[PDB]
């Protein structure tokens, strides 16, 4: 149901952990989703940008979606990132994603191979009939800012749940004033988006590391001292493009193996020493996992190009 | 060999024509490549941005690369667009592309799922050893500008042929002053890139339509009036994201079927009328094909989502 | 659990129904699985020989498996047919199959590209660790009778549930006397198999049509007259290779569309007239669906090659 | 043309060699094909049963086809095994194969998921329009003997080059007496097929090892003692299902790496010792490669399940 999605506040763009040979680490993955559920995350994006969907083959991706529904579908909402810059792929991945039982679809606009505003309408209308859909706007990554007019055109579909919006709180307000549910895509803006700009919540990267704190941040009420306290973490996580920092942090925490699928590559030593201090400053207990945080040696990391 | 690639002036990023069901129209494609050859185009990019590589499955792409080499490899240089935002795909497509006898690879930086500068080097160094390589910078599309420092780092490989640069002529000059071969990726800039900024040539969209005229611009010396003559065609070609304009124009010229793979959608009626006038002004004899240019009506066009 | 699969008695090799363009018709499929549940079937093979697994791409197949698990997993055992003549495919299909929550895998011996008995052991040991496994012997189709020595060798794995045996009741006896669970894969034999030869049950084609009668046959005691009654149906079902008859019969009953993926093709008119009389003799009320059975015209059937 | 294929007398079903990680070893492959050309083989089957087409993903397969055409097409006829038990795959693989320039297609009848005789005609008629076709009958592997009637039905197409026939010389004679070109697919029968039953040639496994000797058997009249001389090699090659013996023999000769894709596993030590004697008796100079034949130890062999 659409309204079940519209009412979600904390959705995690869950990271996809790997085995040393590059394959998904499903044991680690399950542990990750369990810690999300425990600390009150209400949804997960499967193979989003943070989940490195762009580096998956489709059978892996659909497997991971079906897996998450199968294991956790009764505790958390499952949102498959089945979007693509290719309409054919979007169509195919969306209908199969829904068939294995995902609750909603995340659809970005075609990136790289940008299309016209007419083309966008055609693209979204190809997948909107399939079920609850969250449209995903991230111009910094795609090359194209989806204008409000396009969002209003396709909002005629009952199946539009809302927008994962990344251009900023000004855009969110443009939408939330006009009866369109929005989740902030930026962790450094999402407190204000929720409390001041009418966002329903966040689709979050940082909730991978501190789900409990991100829950407190969105559920209880305004709280700038909590927002300020997590900000040094948030900044560290985005000095290089996401999910490079997240990947690096989760491995320092022991919850995932220090394995990267290329083109991503871990943060250097100096940055890794820094994270240890950010953890110490915020308190290890707020971070996922139980293991003492490590700095890790350069030689600990495994980069995979062929898998 | 790298020097054979370094000397090419006119490279056409060839359009990929479709059958009504959405499969490749090899009959129309073959005729397109021959018309490139007749008018002195020196190389082709297979499945580039213009060629809609982004919408192809890999079997189809490798097929088209091998087809092009088999039928035309003796008369024209074949450069497979085997780049990707995924290193695994880039590695895999590039070695398979070379195995079927392509002459060079075009490699963009990872788009959408952007990586760090360190990751860029890792990405590029995974494929440079395989053969002659052209690195492709188009930050409008990718969201990441490849810094000259990165280009200079990877230029330690003897397999770097040069750069398809899209940021502008001033960037081109930064490279050409420093021993780096550059092809302009901007038709509205390529005349001046060649004569004022040290560029070796162009990797062209517009040459799909007027290959003879583009050749003249790079081969004969500064010609401000020929350059001014093509400008209205170029401006038309890029009013919407390439290859929408090109796809539309080739259908109007009757050299391809009016079949579009989504998310692309033809230019509207008014622009199509405009194109008939543009052809008139420049002269029909300068455009590919023999058939009278048509406006085409809306319902002539076939939009393919499932293929 | 392995013991759970071992205690299954009535398992249906469910047919895979299609839409006019050759894609899976999930609406029809869901209704077929429900009718199996209502008349007591305890498990289903998904994409078996009868389910035309041979004609699926793996994305489609894992989708179907995950769909069946998601919709029916709590009411019925889902056995994914993840075997292949390629160990790589078998490995990959099986692990993905279990990850989306299938209860067991069906594993044939490599067919067409036959391997040595040693190769057979290597192949089965590649997949047995992954979960509960039914080994499928059908030398009339594979070209290779799996010898009991091989079965006894691989039976060292705690994950071997049993054998889907197609050679005959005397083979079955060899196994059941020696503590190996067996399901007959021959409908014309399965009654004797279960009552006289120790078979735990059947993996059935005919239950697709008359699940209630197949249940009665296997559950309520030795019944020579009931067995004799179904035999005209069973014989008709296998005049041409299965599932040609079943596909035809289900269309005639109106429970699936008259759509065939090639290389399969429907039974001719005279045979379809014959099916109407078999239905009248057994009684329409014993067959899946509510609609009057039809002969159907030759022109009703759609044959799909490209999908 | 079709006639160009019909006059071919010695065709090799070339082995596909692998690198330690399971990928194609194009360097070894190129040496194998070169050796075939040197000793007068006039065509190759690419990815046949002997070439382990059944273990290949389609992209590496079309790659290998396109590679063989690009590198050797001027010197040898390239026949892609694009046949399948799935008509969709057969259609798809065949046209893509011809697109990259293969000279003919090898087409088997659907194995394992066997179809009706009407089904077979449908299946073959989907691919016969694409290019010169060789129909492949080997019921010991398919479970279905293609009857003469089906061949005569499909022979109405001018694109039927002929039949690769494995059932025996008597079958060959029913065809050759009725204007249909045949290649024997049995090395132990091919001498007599040619000289006594009107076969045009062989499509050979054994020519992978001793191409010159096979040439002599087929181009130089009856020679029962040359024929008897090769027979112990042929018997050794087929004691376990082909290509297990050939893969083993080629490793021993050092012209390929001792690498197997599962389910295939090498012949045991005793047979390897036996091969060394077979080589001594026939004479090393007749076999491919210059290196001294080795026994090889169990330890040397690499079995790949995941690639
Ligand atoms: Br590790
Ligand atoms: Br462009
Ligand atoms: Br058309
Ligand atoms: Br009962
Ligand atoms: Br229908
Ligand atoms: Br009735
Ligand atoms: Br080796
Ligand atoms: Br020797
Ligand atoms: Cl953004
Ligand atoms: Cl600049
Ligand atoms: Cl059997
Ligand atoms: Cl027996
Ligand atoms: Cl045979």
Numbering used by the authors:
A (entry chain H), B (entry chain E), C (entry chain G), D (entry chain A): 21 to 327
Can you quote the paper on this entry?
The lysine-biosynthesis pathway commences with the condensation of pyruvate and (S)-aspartate semialdehyde (ASA), to form (4S)-4-hydroxy-2,3,4,5-tetrahydro-(2S)-dipicolinic acid (HTPA). This reaction is catalyzed by dihydrodipicolinate synthase (DHDPS), which is the product of an essential gene in bacteria. The ‘tight’ dimer interface also contains a cleft that binds the allosteric inhibitor, lysine, which mediates feedback inhibition in DHDPS enzymes from Gram-negative bacteria and plants. In this study, we show for the first time that DHDPS from the plant Vitis vinifera forms a homotetramer or dimer-of-dimers both in solution and the crystal state.
